[PDB]
Symmetry: C2
Subunit: 223 residues, 2 copies
């Protein structure tokens, strides 16, 4: 499990989403390097202009690439579930607005790590920050708090994404996460700890499709 | 099963589709009356302008509402699978063009009959009759040939939809169909005689399809 993530690993991401009365599909490719905790990915909206802001999809669009330092490696659930993988389910409550529900499967296909997701959004306000496109194309840094879940032989996670808004205000998004192991074996049930995330969103300037070029760095701590 | 379809029954149709890079979702509502073999419905493209012609959708957007006369009622699979319902899978080959694959679930939710579908289209030519929107807004009448399928305790159907083209050129669509029970009658070889009208509800600015259909078994 652990030693599948030495060296640069290619990544495929696929997101099928329905929000309110809109649909979209977003595919992404790139590479992951868990020794340094880094992702670089390019995402494309194959269905044309996204009906929701790119930043609202970041957390949905592969935490097995977080850097777990030597003393922390006995708490790395994500890598220990591999190669068979895990299911990642979330409910994301945007304050004073709608909700995303998501179900993803993270696993290896050949040497490529693939994250295939379905997303349903409901009860979004028209001309809220989401459907009204009022969110700045930027990302902040967060702590993803992780606790063992014996009931599922799995982990729970909680955290609040802060999404900067046009008006200087901030749009909060409460994430309530659940992960499990697709196959039978030993997945590591960790002490309460967290992931420290940082992310940069930019845009390939000679790409005329709706897209997102991301840069990320994630490391575990808190023990 | 059978006697769930006496009287007018409300219908919900849910359609999710991906076709050559475009996505779309269609919802439809209306009523069905199997005693007369009738099913009026209004469909709406919630995702905006449909990337494919409405008529191609026909044959995917509830055959439990076909009229089976007294002498034919022992051959009505669709109604006998209720209330639990059936899966309806199809492959639709548009001649000299792409292909729709579909998987639907037809079943009762409360007293409403629901048909929830997923549709994948592939290998469509970009300026064909489908992606190029060259099909007239209409429908013709057809025979849906039905044979029992004991391997899957269900039925297999085959028929060819004729879609009129603006250039007085007809676009054929070969339907291969397979129905199984989520929970059953296994019928003699017979068929459904279908008739359909497609219209628009003036005063509606969304992309839509009003449909009237009359179907009887023979």
């Amino acid at each position: 499990g652990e030693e599948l993530f030495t060296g640069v690993v290619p990544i495929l991401i696929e997101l099928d989403g329905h929000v309110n009365g809109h649909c979209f599909f977003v595919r992404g490719e790139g590479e992951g390097d868990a020794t340094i905790g880094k992702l670089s990915l390019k995402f494309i909206a194959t269905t044309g202009k996204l009906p929701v802001p790119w930043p609202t999809l970041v957390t949905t669009l592969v935490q097995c690439f977080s850097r777990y330092p030597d003393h922390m490696k006995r708490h790395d659930f994500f890598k220990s579930a591999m190669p068979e993988g895990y299911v990642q389910e979330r409910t994301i409550y945007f304050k004073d607005d709608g909700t995303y529900k998501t179900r993803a499967e993270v696993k290896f296909e050949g040497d490529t790590l693939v994250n295939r997701i379905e997303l349903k959004g409901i009860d979004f306000k028209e001309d809220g920050n989401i459907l009204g496109h009022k969110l700045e194309y930027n990302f902040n840094s967060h702590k993803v708090y992780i606790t063992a879940d014996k009931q599922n032989n799995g982990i729970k996670a909680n955290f609040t994404i802060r999404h900067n808004v046009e008006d200087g205000s901030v749009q909060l998004a409460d994430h309530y996460q659940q992960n499990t192991p697709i196959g039978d074996g030993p997945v590591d049930l960790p002490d309460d700890h967290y992931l420290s995330t940082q992310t940069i969103l930019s845009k390939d300037l000679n790409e005329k499709r709706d897209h997102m070029v991301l840069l990320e760095y994630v490391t575990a701590a808190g023990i």
